[PDB]
Ligand code: HEM
């Protein structure tokens with residue numbers, strides 16, 4: 001697909017849709033995560049000692065938002081420029097993932113959790129062309145973070 005002018009137009013449009021509801025889309029996101037992999041719970045400070053995923057924990061929202069922003073930004077960057085640019089941020093990310101005891105087999109957990117979250121976010125407007133466009137953008141960004149973790153470990 002590549003990211004045509006037509007495909008990027010599709011990712012931007014769908015990200016704008018996600019931001020429109022951070023406490024929902026981010027709590028869903030942690031549930032999709034614990035559905036796919038339960039043990040992941042012990043990883044997160046704000047999830048430990050708890051029995052369910054807190055719905056209004058600011059720490060938790062701030063946390064999940066930041067993750068989706070990072071995947072959008074990556075898609076536009078692909079259409080316009082043709083690539084994903086690795087900065088300070090992407091590298092610090094790689095450090096903290098290792099402190100917290102996170103591995104690569106964890107990544108398809110958080111991907112499916114994000115494609116499923118966006119399919120849920122865009123509903124009937126969903127196209128093969130759009131799925132293809134976020135898939136392309138996650139893959140391309142994960143390729144970069146995994147790359148930095150392996151560097152932070
Ligand atoms: C392209 C995919 C990913 C992106 C964009 C991303 C982004 C981030 C960011 C931005 C932070 C720090 C948040 C803060 O300062 O507020 C963080 C922390 C963390 N990440 Fe991820 N991440 C990704 C994949 C993963 C995966 C696959 C896992 C494993 C399940 C994971 C587990 C964690 C943990 C345990 C922390 C520490 C949270 C705490 O303070 O207790 N991440 N990540």
Ligand SMILES: O=C(O)c1cccnc1
Nearest residue numbers: 044060062063064067110
């Ligand atoms: O909340 C976090 O810090 C988080 C969630 C998913 C992936 N990475 C980090």
